[PDB]
Amino acid sequence: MPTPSMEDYLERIYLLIEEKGYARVSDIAEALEVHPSSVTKMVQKLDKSDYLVYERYRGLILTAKGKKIGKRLVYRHDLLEDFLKMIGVDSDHIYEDVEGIEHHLSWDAIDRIGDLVQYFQEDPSRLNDLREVQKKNE
Amino acid sequence: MPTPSMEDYLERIYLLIEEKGYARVSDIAEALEVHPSSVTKMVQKLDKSDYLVYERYRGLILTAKGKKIGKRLVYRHDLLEDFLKMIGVDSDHIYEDVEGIEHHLSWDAIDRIGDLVQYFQEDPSRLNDLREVQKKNE
Ligand SMILES: [Mg+2]
Ligand SMILES: [Mn+2]
Ligand SMILES: [Mn+2]
């Protein structure tokens, strides 16, 4: 039911509190380089759906549901960056390829990439074999 | 330089040409599920910049440029489809996942995914190991 950009907002709020203990509307406007009225409108939609609350001095506060979604997206980003690093995507492309995947892949597929990432680490000689395949191509 | 929309046309045109020598406007409309008048507008755009030619009583044939692009696009769709099958995504999620991400991955990542698919092809017992990780992880 939440749009991808609603989820990205919860992820950003969780990481703002990780960085300094608070999430402000002004923080999000400055980072996205948008007008603060679009942020307060997004905050309003997230508030009405019970993902966050707002109190003027503490700022933006995640609910149990909002904090669960925000953490999940941080870890999705990690998992997919691990995947793309493992298979050899270069540093110029990996970031936009992670943002590309994470917005257009079902959660079933994300889970399967998580199994794959686990597969290459339970016996790391699998990863050396994969890199041999790349070198003999190269 | 070609837009996502052009890439979806060029890929379908290549498949039909691959099967039949020419791509008819009516088969393109059917496959992409758009109104024939949309195809015409795209056909006129792609004709004007030399991706294709319209031949009377035949349909569309790609130029060297359009065919090079269209062949690469079909390779991308087919490689991603194999990739998702291989890591076990539900057969109900596959076409829509592929149509999703295919416009959002660099060619660098497509090549590395190709290295990954080749890694599993060169010793298919690696697919059985991968399946054990997934059954265990559950
Ligand atoms: Mg992100
Ligand atoms: Mn496609
Ligand atoms: Mn597509």
Method: X-ray
Q: Is A37 exposed, middle or buried (0-12, 13-18, 19+ CB in 10 A)?
A: exposed
Spatial CA neighbour of B17 closest among B58, B51, B61, B55: B61
Q: What is the three-class DSSP state of A23?
A: strand
The phi-psi region of residue A50 (left if phi > 0; otherwise alpha if psi is between -120 and 50; otherwise beta) is: left
Spatial distance between the Cα atoms of A22 and A15, rounded to a whole number of angstroms: 9
Tokens representing A14 are: 């969780």
Q: CB-side exposure of B64: number of CA atoms within 13 Å?
A: 0
The radius of gyration of chain A's CA atoms, rounded to the nearest angstrom, is: 18
Asked if residue A11 belongs to a known ligand binding site, the reply is: yes
Please provide residue B88's backbone torsions phi and psi, each rounded to the nearest 5 degrees.
95, 20
Reported resolution, Å: 2.5
Could you tell me the sign of the dihedral formed by the alpha carbons of B50, B54, B59, B64, in that order? Answer: negative
Q: What is the three-class DSSP state of A6?
A: helix
Report all structural domains of chain B as residue ranges with CATH numbers, in order of start: 1-73 (1.10.10.10), 74-138 (1.10.60.10)
Tokens representing B6 are: 């052009």
H helix or E strand, kind and range, residue A73: helix A64-87
The runs of H, that is alpha helices, within B2-63 are 4-20, 25-32, 36-48
Ligand 2 geometric centre to CA of A65 (Å):
35
Ligand 3 geometric centre to CA of B4 (Å):
7
Min Cα separation A72/chain B (Å): 18
